[PDB]
Each structure stands twice: as structure tokens, then as C-alpha cells.
mmCIF file of all heavy atoms in Angstrom:
data_model
loop_
_atom_site.group_PDB
_atom_site.id
_atom_site.type_symbol
_atom_site.label_atom_id
_atom_site.label_comp_id
_atom_site.label_asym_id
_atom_site.label_seq_id
_atom_site.Cartn_x
_atom_site.Cartn_y
_atom_site.Cartn_z
ATOM 1 N N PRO A 1 -2.966 12.914 -3.352
ATOM 2 C CA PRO A 1 -2.078 13.326 -2.255
ATOM 3 C C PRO A 1 -0.896 12.367 -1.987
ATOM 4 O O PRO A 1 -1.067 11.150 -1.917
ATOM 5 C CB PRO A 1 -3.030 13.438 -1.049
ATOM 6 C CG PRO A 1 -4.404 13.500 -1.620
ATOM 7 C CD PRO A 1 -4.337 12.661 -2.878
ATOM 8 N N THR A 2 0.301 12.929 -1.880
ATOM 9 C CA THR A 2 1.424 12.207 -1.300
ATOM 10 C C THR A 2 1.307 12.384 0.231
ATOM 11 O O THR A 2 1.347 13.511 0.716
ATOM 12 C CB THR A 2 2.764 12.716 -1.796
ATOM 13 O OG1 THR A 2 2.868 12.513 -3.221
ATOM 14 C CG2 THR A 2 3.933 11.976 -1.091
ATOM 15 N N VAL A 3 1.107 11.267 0.954
ATOM 16 C CA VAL A 3 0.928 11.281 2.402
ATOM 17 C C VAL A 3 2.174 10.651 3.069
ATOM 18 O O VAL A 3 2.450 9.480 2.888
ATOM 19 C CB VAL A 3 -0.335 10.479 2.855
ATOM 20 C CG1 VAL A 3 -0.519 10.582 4.399
ATOM 21 C CG2 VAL A 3 -1.611 10.931 2.112
ATOM 22 N N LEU A 4 2.900 11.432 3.860
ATOM 23 C CA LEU A 4 4.011 10.915 4.661
ATOM 24 C C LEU A 4 3.511 10.395 6.008
ATOM 25 O O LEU A 4 2.847 11.127 6.742
ATOM 26 C CB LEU A 4 5.025 12.056 4.889
ATOM 27 C CG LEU A 4 6.231 11.703 5.801
ATOM 28 C CD1 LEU A 4 7.057 10.569 5.216
ATOM 29 C CD2 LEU A 4 7.052 12.911 6.087
ATOM 30 N N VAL A 5 3.798 9.137 6.345
ATOM 31 C CA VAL A 5 3.540 8.660 7.702
ATOM 32 C C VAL A 5 4.885 8.550 8.449
ATOM 33 O O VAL A 5 5.797 7.898 7.981
ATOM 34 C CB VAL A 5 2.650 7.317 7.743
ATOM 35 C CG1 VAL A 5 3.164 6.237 6.827
ATOM 36 C CG2 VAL A 5 2.472 6.787 9.179
ATOM 37 N N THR A 6 5.015 9.228 9.592
ATOM 38 C CA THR A 6 6.234 9.079 10.390
ATOM 39 C C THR A 6 6.017 8.053 11.550
ATOM 40 O O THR A 6 4.884 7.842 11.978
ATOM 41 C CB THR A 6 6.643 10.409 10.969
ATOM 42 O OG1 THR A 6 5.624 10.845 11.863
ATOM 43 C CG2 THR A 6 6.792 11.471 9.869
ATOM 44 N N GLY A 7 7.090 7.444 12.066
ATOM 45 C CA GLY A 7 6.971 6.252 12.926
ATOM 46 C C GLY A 7 6.372 5.074 12.186
ATOM 47 O O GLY A 7 5.628 4.272 12.758
ATOM 48 N N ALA A 8 6.700 4.994 10.900
ATOM 49 C CA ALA A 8 6.093 4.060 9.974
ATOM 50 C C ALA A 8 6.519 2.628 10.261
ATOM 51 O O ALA A 8 5.873 1.702 9.793
ATOM 52 C CB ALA A 8 6.410 4.440 8.555
ATOM 53 N N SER A 9 7.603 2.447 11.024
ATOM 54 C CA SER A 9 7.986 1.106 11.470
ATOM 55 C C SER A 9 7.366 0.804 12.857
ATOM 56 O O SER A 9 7.567 -0.281 13.402
ATOM 57 C CB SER A 9 9.525 0.935 11.497
ATOM 58 O OG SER A 9 10.061 1.610 12.609
ATOM 59 N N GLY A 10 6.641 1.781 13.425
ATOM 60 C CA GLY A 10 5.899 1.592 14.665
ATOM 61 C C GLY A 10 4.735 0.639 14.453
ATOM 62 O O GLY A 10 4.453 0.248 13.330
ATOM 63 N N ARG A 11 4.098 0.247 15.557
ATOM 64 C CA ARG A 11 3.040 -0.755 15.549
ATOM 65 C C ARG A 11 1.783 -0.203 14.882
ATOM 66 O O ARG A 11 1.260 -0.826 13.982
ATOM 67 C CB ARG A 11 2.769 -1.230 16.976
ATOM 68 C CG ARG A 11 3.803 -2.209 17.536
ATOM 69 C CD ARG A 11 3.643 -2.363 19.069
ATOM 70 N NE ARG A 11 3.933 -1.111 19.787
ATOM 71 C CZ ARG A 11 4.024 -1.003 21.113
ATOM 72 N NH1 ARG A 11 3.848 -2.066 21.870
ATOM 73 N NH2 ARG A 11 4.294 0.166 21.693
ATOM 74 N N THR A 12 1.316 0.971 15.300
ATOM 75 C CA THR A 12 0.225 1.654 14.564
ATOM 76 C C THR A 12 0.750 2.229 13.230
ATOM 77 O O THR A 12 0.137 2.048 12.182
ATOM 78 C CB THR A 12 -0.472 2.764 15.413
ATOM 79 O OG1 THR A 12 -0.785 2.233 16.707
ATOM 80 C CG2 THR A 12 -1.787 3.289 14.715
ATOM 81 N N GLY A 13 1.911 2.877 13.273
ATOM 82 C CA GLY A 13 2.498 3.492 12.062
ATOM 83 C C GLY A 13 2.569 2.602 10.840
ATOM 84 O O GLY A 13 2.260 3.047 9.732
ATOM 85 N N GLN A 14 2.952 1.330 11.031
ATOM 86 C CA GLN A 14 3.048 0.370 9.900
ATOM 87 C C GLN A 14 1.709 -0.081 9.280
ATOM 88 O O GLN A 14 1.631 -0.354 8.083
ATOM 89 C CB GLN A 14 3.952 -0.842 10.245
ATOM 90 C CG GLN A 14 3.377 -1.836 11.242
ATOM 91 C CD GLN A 14 4.378 -2.930 11.555
ATOM 92 O OE1 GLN A 14 4.825 -3.067 12.699
ATOM 93 N NE2 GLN A 14 4.780 -3.679 10.520
ATOM 94 N N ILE A 15 0.667 -0.151 10.094
ATOM 95 C CA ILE A 15 -0.716 -0.300 9.589
ATOM 96 C C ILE A 15 -1.162 0.937 8.764
ATOM 97 O O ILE A 15 -1.702 0.809 7.658
ATOM 98 C CB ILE A 15 -1.720 -0.619 10.743
ATOM 99 C CG1 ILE A 15 -1.205 -1.772 11.644
ATOM 100 C CG2 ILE A 15 -3.166 -0.902 10.153
ATOM 101 C CD1 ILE A 15 -1.990 -1.945 12.989
ATOM 102 N N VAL A 16 -0.912 2.141 9.282
ATOM 103 C CA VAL A 16 -1.110 3.365 8.468
ATOM 104 C C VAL A 16 -0.336 3.285 7.135
ATOM 105 O O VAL A 16 -0.937 3.479 6.071
ATOM 106 C CB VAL A 16 -0.881 4.677 9.247
ATOM 107 C CG1 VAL A 16 -1.134 5.889 8.386
ATOM 108 C CG2 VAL A 16 -1.839 4.768 10.392
ATOM 109 N N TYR A 17 0.940 2.925 7.186
ATOM 110 C CA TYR A 17 1.746 2.787 5.983
ATOM 111 C C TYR A 17 1.153 1.779 4.974
ATOM 112 O O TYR A 17 1.020 2.099 3.802
ATOM 113 C CB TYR A 17 3.200 2.446 6.343
ATOM 114 C CG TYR A 17 4.084 2.171 5.152
ATOM 115 C CD1 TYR A 17 4.545 3.195 4.327
ATOM 116 C CD2 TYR A 17 4.493 0.862 4.868
ATOM 117 C CE1 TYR A 17 5.344 2.906 3.215
ATOM 118 C CE2 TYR A 17 5.296 0.578 3.794
ATOM 119 C CZ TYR A 17 5.697 1.578 2.959
ATOM 120 O OH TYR A 17 6.506 1.227 1.905
ATOM 121 N N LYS A 18 0.771 0.585 5.430
ATOM 122 C CA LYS A 18 0.218 -0.411 4.521
ATOM 123 C C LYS A 18 -1.131 0.002 3.940
ATOM 124 O O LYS A 18 -1.348 -0.156 2.743
ATOM 125 C CB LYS A 18 0.163 -1.797 5.184
ATOM 126 C CG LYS A 18 1.496 -2.552 5.111
ATOM 127 C CD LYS A 18 1.219 -4.069 4.965
ATOM 128 C CE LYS A 18 2.434 -4.921 5.306
ATOM 129 N NZ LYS A 18 2.034 -6.040 6.199
ATOM 130 N N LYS A 19 -2.012 0.564 4.760
ATOM 131 C CA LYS A 19 -3.297 1.055 4.293
ATOM 132 C C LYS A 19 -3.216 2.185 3.250
ATOM 133 O O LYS A 19 -4.093 2.293 2.371
ATOM 134 C CB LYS A 19 -4.146 1.495 5.477
ATOM 135 C CG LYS A 19 -4.695 0.341 6.333
ATOM 136 C CD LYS A 19 -5.556 0.923 7.456
ATOM 137 C CE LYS A 19 -6.345 -0.143 8.220
ATOM 138 N NZ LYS A 19 -7.540 -0.604 7.474
ATOM 139 N N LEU A 20 -2.187 3.031 3.360
ATOM 140 C CA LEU A 20 -1.900 4.044 2.340
ATOM 141 C C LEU A 20 -1.379 3.377 1.054
ATOM 142 O O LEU A 20 -1.638 3.884 -0.036
ATOM 143 C CB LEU A 20 -0.908 5.106 2.840
ATOM 144 C CG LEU A 20 -1.260 6.119 3.924
ATOM 145 C CD1 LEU A 20 0.000 6.877 4.318
ATOM 146 C CD2 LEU A 20 -2.349 7.108 3.466
ATOM 147 N N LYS A 21 -0.655 2.257 1.189
ATOM 148 C CA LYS A 21 -0.174 1.434 0.058
ATOM 149 C C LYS A 21 -1.245 0.501 -0.551
ATOM 150 O O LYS A 21 -1.379 0.473 -1.764
ATOM 151 C CB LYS A 21 1.046 0.593 0.456
ATOM 152 C CG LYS A 21 2.309 1.365 0.757
ATOM 153 C CD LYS A 21 3.170 1.506 -0.462
ATOM 154 C CE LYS A 21 4.246 0.431 -0.524
ATOM 155 N NZ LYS A 21 5.195 0.701 -1.667
ATOM 156 N N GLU A 22 -1.963 -0.271 0.283
ATOM 157 C CA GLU A 22 -3.151 -1.063 -0.126
ATOM 158 C C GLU A 22 -4.131 -0.225 -0.912
ATOM 159 O O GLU A 22 -4.498 -0.581 -2.033
ATOM 160 C CB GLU A 22 -3.912 -1.615 1.083
ATOM 161 C CG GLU A 22 -3.653 -3.092 1.423
ATOM 162 C CD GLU A 22 -3.757 -3.375 2.920
ATOM 163 O OE1 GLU A 22 -4.634 -2.784 3.606
ATOM 164 O OE2 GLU A 22 -2.939 -4.182 3.416
ATOM 165 N N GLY A 23 -4.571 0.876 -0.311
ATOM 166 C CA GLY A 23 -5.297 1.918 -1.041
ATOM 167 C C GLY A 23 -4.369 2.986 -1.613
ATOM 168 O O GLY A 23 -4.610 4.177 -1.414
ATOM 169 N N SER A 24 -3.305 2.573 -2.316
ATOM 170 C CA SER A 24 -2.406 3.534 -3.002
ATOM 171 C C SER A 24 -3.014 3.939 -4.357
ATOM 172 O O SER A 24 -2.308 4.252 -5.346
ATOM 173 C CB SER A 24 -0.950 3.030 -3.109
ATOM 174 O OG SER A 24 -0.574 2.629 -4.418
ATOM 175 N N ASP A 25 -4.350 3.924 -4.357
ATOM 176 C CA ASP A 25 -5.171 4.489 -5.406
ATOM 177 C C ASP A 25 -5.532 5.931 -5.029
ATOM 178 O O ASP A 25 -5.269 6.855 -5.806
ATOM 179 C CB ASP A 25 -6.406 3.598 -5.671
ATOM 180 C CG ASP A 25 -7.189 3.264 -4.399
ATOM 181 O OD1 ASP A 25 -6.566 3.054 -3.330
ATOM 182 O OD2 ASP A 25 -8.444 3.213 -4.477
ATOM 183 N N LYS A 26 -6.089 6.142 -3.836
ATOM 184 C CA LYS A 26 -6.421 7.492 -3.396
ATOM 185 C C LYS A 26 -5.224 8.305 -2.868
ATOM 186 O O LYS A 26 -5.318 9.557 -2.752
ATOM 187 C CB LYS A 26 -7.506 7.468 -2.328
ATOM 188 C CG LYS A 26 -8.869 7.019 -2.766
ATOM 189 C CD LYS A 26 -9.895 7.551 -1.732
ATOM 190 C CE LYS A 26 -11.181 6.763 -1.724
ATOM 191 N NZ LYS A 26 -12.053 7.102 -2.874
ATOM 192 N N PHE A 27 -4.129 7.595 -2.513
ATOM 193 C CA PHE A 27 -2.904 8.203 -1.977
ATOM 194 C C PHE A 27 -1.609 7.673 -2.589
ATOM 195 O O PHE A 27 -1.532 6.528 -2.996
ATOM 196 C CB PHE A 27 -2.766 7.912 -0.496
ATOM 197 C CG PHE A 27 -4.003 8.094 0.281
ATOM 198 C CD1 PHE A 27 -4.697 6.982 0.738
ATOM 199 C CD2 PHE A 27 -4.482 9.376 0.580
ATOM 200 C CE1 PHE A 27 -5.848 7.135 1.507
ATOM 201 C CE2 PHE A 27 -5.648 9.543 1.338
ATOM 202 C CZ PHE A 27 -6.329 8.411 1.804
ATOM 203 N N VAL A 28 -0.578 8.513 -2.608
ATOM 204 C CA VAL A 28 0.794 8.008 -2.684
ATOM 205 C C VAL A 28 1.337 7.976 -1.233
ATOM 206 O O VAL A 28 1.320 9.002 -0.524
ATOM 207 C CB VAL A 28 1.672 8.847 -3.606
ATOM 208 C CG1 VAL A 28 3.006 8.161 -3.831
ATOM 209 C CG2 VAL A 28 0.977 9.061 -4.936
ATOM 210 N N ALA A 29 1.708 6.768 -0.803
ATOM 211 C CA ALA A 29 2.364 6.500 0.461
ATOM 212 C C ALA A 29 3.856 6.877 0.510
ATOM 213 O O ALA A 29 4.612 6.701 -0.445
ATOM 214 C CB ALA A 29 2.193 5.017 0.812
ATOM 215 N N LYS A 30 4.268 7.387 1.663
ATOM 216 C CA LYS A 30 5.648 7.709 1.957
ATOM 217 C C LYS A 30 5.768 7.447 3.474
ATOM 218 O O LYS A 30 4.877 7.799 4.241
ATOM 219 C CB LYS A 30 5.911 9.183 1.621
ATOM 220 C CG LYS A 30 7.310 9.554 1.280
ATOM 221 C CD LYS A 30 7.384 11.053 0.837
ATOM 222 C CE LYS A 30 8.771 11.410 0.284
ATOM 223 N NZ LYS A 30 8.925 12.867 -0.135
ATOM 224 N N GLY A 31 6.852 6.799 3.882
ATOM 225 C CA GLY A 31 7.089 6.488 5.281
ATOM 226 C C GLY A 31 8.378 7.126 5.775
ATOM 227 O O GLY A 31 9.333 7.271 5.031
ATOM 228 N N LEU A 32 8.387 7.549 7.030
ATOM 229 C CA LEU A 32 9.637 7.912 7.690
ATOM 230 C C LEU A 32 9.884 6.952 8.843
ATOM 231 O O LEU A 32 9.006 6.737 9.679
ATOM 232 C CB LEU A 32 9.624 9.375 8.188
ATOM 233 C CG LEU A 32 10.822 9.784 9.072
ATOM 234 C CD1 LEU A 32 12.114 10.014 8.244
ATOM 235 C CD2 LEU A 32 10.477 11.035 9.899
ATOM 236 N N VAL A 33 11.095 6.383 8.882
ATOM 237 C CA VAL A 33 11.548 5.515 9.962
ATOM 238 C C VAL A 33 12.894 5.987 10.537
ATOM 239 O O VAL A 33 13.596 6.752 9.901
ATOM 240 C CB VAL A 33 11.615 4.034 9.540
ATOM 241 C CG1 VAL A 33 10.251 3.570 9.060
ATOM 242 C CG2 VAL A 33 12.726 3.783 8.459
ATOM 243 N N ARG A 34 13.223 5.545 11.746
ATOM 244 C CA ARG A 34 14.423 6.017 12.462
ATOM 245 C C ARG A 34 15.715 5.258 12.054
ATOM 246 O O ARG A 34 16.808 5.803 12.181
ATOM 247 C CB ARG A 34 14.210 5.930 13.992
ATOM 248 C CG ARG A 34 15.478 6.227 14.806
ATOM 249 C CD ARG A 34 15.236 6.253 16.309
ATOM 250 N NE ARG A 34 14.539 5.084 16.848
ATOM 251 C CZ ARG A 34 14.027 5.031 18.079
ATOM 252 N NH1 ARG A 34 14.132 6.084 18.898
ATOM 253 N NH2 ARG A 34 13.398 3.930 18.494
ATOM 254 N N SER A 35 15.577 4.020 11.574
ATOM 255 C CA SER A 35 16.729 3.163 11.271
ATOM 256 C C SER A 35 16.534 2.333 10.020
ATOM 257 O O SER A 35 15.421 2.211 9.506
ATOM 258 C CB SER A 35 17.037 2.230 12.440
ATOM 259 O OG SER A 35 15.945 1.361 12.645
ATOM 260 N N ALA A 36 17.634 1.752 9.542
ATOM 261 C CA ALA A 36 17.628 0.876 8.378
ATOM 262 C C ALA A 36 16.912 -0.431 8.715
ATOM 263 O O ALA A 36 16.220 -0.997 7.878
ATOM 264 C CB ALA A 36 19.102 0.621 7.872
ATOM 265 N N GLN A 37 17.064 -0.891 9.953
ATOM 266 C CA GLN A 37 16.300 -2.032 10.468
ATOM 267 C C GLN A 37 14.764 -1.798 10.370
ATOM 268 O O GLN A 37 14.012 -2.705 10.001
ATOM 269 C CB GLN A 37 16.699 -2.324 11.927
ATOM 270 C CG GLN A 37 16.089 -3.637 12.460
ATOM 271 C CD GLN A 37 16.465 -3.960 13.895
ATOM 272 O OE1 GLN A 37 15.958 -3.339 14.836
ATOM 273 N NE2 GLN A 37 17.337 -4.953 14.070
ATOM 274 N N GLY A 38 14.317 -0.582 10.696
ATOM 275 C CA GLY A 38 12.891 -0.241 10.631
ATOM 276 C C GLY A 38 12.419 -0.250 9.198
ATOM 277 O O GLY A 38 11.337 -0.723 8.905
ATOM 278 N N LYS A 39 13.248 0.274 8.295
ATOM 279 C CA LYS A 39 12.894 0.367 6.888
ATOM 280 C C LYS A 39 12.731 -1.003 6.262
ATOM 281 O O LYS A 39 11.877 -1.202 5.410
ATOM 282 C CB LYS A 39 13.951 1.188 6.121
ATOM 283 C CG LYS A 39 13.957 0.940 4.621
ATOM 284 C CD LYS A 39 14.443 2.112 3.847
ATOM 285 C CE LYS A 39 14.118 1.909 2.399
ATOM 286 N NZ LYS A 39 14.767 2.906 1.517
ATOM 287 N N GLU A 40 13.568 -1.946 6.666
ATOM 288 C CA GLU A 40 13.498 -3.287 6.102
ATOM 289 C C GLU A 40 12.304 -4.051 6.684
ATOM 290 O O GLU A 40 11.585 -4.716 5.951
ATOM 291 C CB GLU A 40 14.834 -4.042 6.253
ATOM 292 C CG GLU A 40 16.141 -3.228 5.933
ATOM 293 C CD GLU A 40 16.089 -2.241 4.723
ATOM 294 O OE1 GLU A 40 15.496 -2.579 3.662
ATOM 295 O OE2 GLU A 40 16.679 -1.120 4.842
ATOM 296 N N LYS A 41 12.074 -3.913 7.989
ATOM 297 C CA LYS A 41 10.887 -4.455 8.683
ATOM 298 C C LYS A 41 9.577 -4.219 7.943
ATOM 299 O O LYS A 41 8.676 -5.055 7.997
ATOM 300 C CB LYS A 41 10.805 -3.841 10.092
ATOM 301 C CG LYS A 41 9.591 -4.205 10.908
ATOM 302 C CD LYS A 41 9.433 -3.240 12.078
ATOM 303 C CE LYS A 41 8.883 -3.935 13.310
ATOM 304 N NZ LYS A 41 8.884 -3.016 14.474
ATOM 305 N N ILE A 42 9.468 -3.074 7.262
ATOM 306 C CA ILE A 42 8.235 -2.706 6.593
ATOM 307 C C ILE A 42 8.249 -2.939 5.092
ATOM 308 O O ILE A 42 7.370 -2.486 4.377
ATOM 309 C CB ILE A 42 7.695 -1.249 6.969
ATOM 310 C CG1 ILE A 42 8.559 -0.111 6.407
ATOM 311 C CG2 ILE A 42 7.408 -1.131 8.467
ATOM 312 C CD1 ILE A 42 8.054 1.301 6.829
ATOM 313 N N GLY A 43 9.231 -3.686 4.608
ATOM 314 C CA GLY A 43 9.270 -3.998 3.181
ATOM 315 C C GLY A 43 10.464 -3.405 2.472
ATOM 316 O O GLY A 43 10.792 -3.820 1.345
ATOM 317 N N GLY A 44 11.119 -2.441 3.126
ATOM 318 C CA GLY A 44 12.372 -1.849 2.631
ATOM 319 C C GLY A 44 12.219 -1.019 1.373
ATOM 320 O O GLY A 44 13.223 -0.590 0.774
#
């Protein structure tokens, strides 16, 4: 599964994003963020 997490630069959202990436064996991670600042905050 490709799993999109939205609010991925959020406080809970970014833990969801990393856990989908850490375990990016069972999932392909995809994040949605509101700004370029948010995107870089999470690894860009």
C-alpha cells in the first residue's frame, strides 16, 4: 500500500509519517504538508 498521511508536518502527523517510513517495508509512505517549511521540517 501507498499510504498518504496529511498534516504530516504536524506533531502526531510526523510520527505517523516516520513510522510509515521506518516500516517502509509494509508501506510506501507519502506525506501532505501545508508549506515548504513543513516539508523541510520532516526531512524534505
Side-chain angles (χ1 to χ4, degrees):
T2 297
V3 183
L4 176 61
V5 50
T6 64
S9 75
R11 283 166 295 188
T12 312
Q14 71 183 117
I15 311 167
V16 182
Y17 175 75
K18 277 214 197 133
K19 288 182 170 282
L20 291 172
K21 293 268 264 187
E22 259 148 38
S24 107
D25 52 323
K26 292 201 202 283
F27 315 107
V28 189
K30 206 175 188 181
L32 172 76
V33 302
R34 172 175 51 193
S35 63
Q37 189 180 74
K39 159 152 193 190
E40 317 321 319
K41 176 196 215 174
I42 70 182

